[PDB]
Structure formats: C-alpha cells, structure tokens
Amino acid sequence: SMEQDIFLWRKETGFGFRILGGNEPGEPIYIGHIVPLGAADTDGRLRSGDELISVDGTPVIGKSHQLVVQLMQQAAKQGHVNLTVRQTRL
C-alpha cells in the first residue's frame, strides 16, 4: 500500500463511510462499509479495508476511534473532510 489524501465534500446524506478498529489505542483503524451512492462511493477513491492514518491533518495512528469520532464530528460541521489513508495499488 501507499499513503493517499482524499478530500470529500459532504453531501446531504453525509460522507457515506463507516470505520472499523481503533477500539483501543494501538489497534489499527480501517475504512469499513462504504454507503452505495454516498459521497465516498461517488468519489470512487476510498475503499473498504484502507487504513486510516489521519483526519484533517490530525494523525489517528495508534489512537482511539474516539479521536476519529471527534474529528468526524467536526468534519460533519464544516461539511468536508480530508482523509489520509494507506491504499492498495490497483
């Protein structure tokens, strides 16, 4: 894999992706379910299984999903997000 930045404008339906892991610090955080026809799906770049490493410049590596909860709460509020993910070369 390799690190990629993915900026998404929020839609009325949201960003359209779920998260897995980071249940405790040190447990890796991954992109889970991507909502069909949602913002992430339509953009096309984000994939389930991509490892999340930062949100809007804030590193989430080794951190709790609770930090991501906070970061995505703000991402909702501002109506956009910039995700750094490790992605599979296709």
Swiss-Prot record:
Residues 3-59 form the PDZ domain. Coiled coil: none annotated. Plays a role in coupling actin fibers to cell junctions in endothelial cells, via its interaction with AMOTL2 and CDH5. May regulate acid-induced ASIC3 currents by modulating its expression at the cell surface. It comes from Homo sapiens (Human). Widely expressed with the exception of skeletal muscle. Isoform 1, isoform 2 and isoform 6 are highly expressed in colon, kidney, lung, liver, and pancreas. Isoform 5 is predominantly expressed in brain and heart. Isoform 3 and isoform 4 are highly expressed in pancreas and brain. It comes from the Eukaryota. It is found in: Cell junction, Tight junction; Cell membrane. This is Membrane-associated guanylate kinase, WW and PDZ domain-containing protein 1. Part of a complex composed of AMOTL2, MAGI1 and CDH5, within the complex AMOTL2 acts as a scaffold protein for the interaction of MAGI1 with CDH5. The complex is required for coupling actin fibers to cell junctions in endothelial cells. Interacts through its WW 2 domain with SYNPO and through its PDZ 5 domain with ACTN4. Interacts with cytoplasmic domain of ADGRB1. Interacts via its WW domains with DRPLA. Interacts with ESAM, LRP2 and CXADR. May interact with CTNNB1. Interacts through its PDZ 1 domain with NET1. Interacts with ASIC3 and AMOT. Interacts with FCHSD2. The chain holds residues 839 to 922 of 1491 of the full protein.
